[PDB]
């Protein structure tokens, strides 16, 4: 990232800086990466963070300059489609099944995150057009 990129990213970082010291928490580093359009795993975030311990993960703070190499390291469709097609072959996916698997397998999310992103995107049968929802969430 160049100075222009660093300035836009720093402004975003400061928006996520909730203490005013120019720093975020380890637990916010992933949040910042996600805020910039990336979809990193929890594992990649923890790896670039240096596998922090619970105590420093929840209370040790790092500024943007330490975050930047980590964002870089993390940074460095048909499979995504097949991943959604696992739970289908009429081009649909049950909302209940996607909700269950996203909240119980893998890097489990909360029911509220899934309800929020899924609100208004599933139809009356409780079916999700996964190609359209996926394109929407990837934009």
């Amino acid at each position: 990232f160049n100075k222009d990129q660093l300035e836009e990213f720093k402004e975003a970082f400061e928006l996520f800086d909730r203490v005013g010291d120019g720093k975020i928490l380890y637990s916010q580093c992933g949040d910042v990466m996600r805020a910039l359009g990336q979809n990193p795993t929890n594992a990649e975030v923890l790896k670039v963070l240096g596998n922090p311990k619970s105590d420093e993960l929840k209370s040790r703070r790092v500024d943007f300059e330490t975050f930047l190499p980590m964002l870089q390291a993390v940074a460095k469709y048909e499979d995504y489609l097949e991943g959604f097609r696992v739970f289908d072959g009429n081009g649909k996916v049950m909302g209940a099944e996607l909700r269950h698997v996203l909240t119980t397998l893998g890097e489990k999310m909360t029911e509220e995150e899934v309800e929020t992103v899924l609100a208004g995107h599933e139809d009356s049968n409780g079916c999700i057009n996964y190609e359209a929802f996926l394109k929407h969430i990837l934009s």
Partner: protein, 144 residues
């Protein structure tokens, strides 16, 4: 010579606990009872064969998760022959009967593991993408 004139059907009774407690099951007693009834050496003999026998359609239902939408044919038997011959490279682990797939002991667990591993990798990829989308939107809220 009385039983050989006849067609057998077998029952085994096991005693779960020495104290006649209702619906309690002492593993140390029950293992001994199962050995004494020959059930365990029966199972050891069965495990040498093809224990696990699956109908083509229920197999296809279970393992389409592992199957590319290209590769499923109209012909179930040929579809499964293809898929299984890729998924389990040693052909000696299964036989294609007229009506059922026969598996050796262990291989249906292998197929279930590789299915679960595919399903997990897909779920991780999708859900991490949804997490990064949602927090990207929370960033747009904070910019607003």
């Amino acid at each position: 010579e009385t039983l050989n004139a006849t067609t057998p059907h077998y029952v085994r009774c096991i005693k779960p606990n020495d104290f006649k407690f209702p619906f309690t099951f002492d593993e140390k007693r029950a293992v001994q009872q199962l050995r004494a009834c020959g059930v365990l050496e029966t199972i050891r003999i069965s495990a040498a064969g093809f224990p696990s026998r699956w109908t083509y359609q229920e197999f296809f239902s279970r393992y389409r998760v592992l199957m590319k939408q290209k590769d499923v044919l109209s012909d179930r038997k040929q579809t499964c022959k293809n898929v299984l011959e890729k998924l389990i490279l040693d052909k000696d682990k299964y036989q294609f009967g007229k009506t059922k797939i026969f598996f050796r002991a262990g291989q249906v667990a292998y197929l279930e593991k590789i299915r679960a591993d595919k399903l997990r990798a897909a779920c991780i990829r999708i859900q991490k993408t949804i997490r990064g989308w949602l927090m990207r939107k929370k960033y747009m809220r904070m910019r607003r």
